[PDB]
Amino acid sequence: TSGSIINHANNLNKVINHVFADKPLISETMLKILTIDGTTGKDGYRNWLD
């Protein structure tokens, strides 16, 4: 349903903003792996969380 999709989109953005605020929850070791294709680290973690 459109309601479930929208809920996932908004909630996940809030989570992804909180984890990267101040000291990130994920070390730079994974960020290098997730950004190997040039994708921004914030976008890389969000796609992996999906």
Partner: protein
């Protein structure tokens, strides 16, 4: 492009014949896939729902 034939050669060819030709050459993408329907409803705010 893939089987190395001119358009006029395969003008009378049927869909299944073309699909068979591509698969022998080694091209897997020879099919079209249906989309998935999503249900959506708007809230009855000063108006009947949709």
């Amino acid at each position: 492009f893939l089987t190395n034939t001119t358009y006029d050669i395969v003008n009378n060819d049927t869909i299944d014949v073309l699909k068979m030709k591509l698969r022998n050459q080694g091209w897997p993408f020879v099919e079209r896939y249906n989309a998935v329907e999503i249900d959506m409803s708007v809230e009855p705010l000063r108006s009947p729902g949709q």
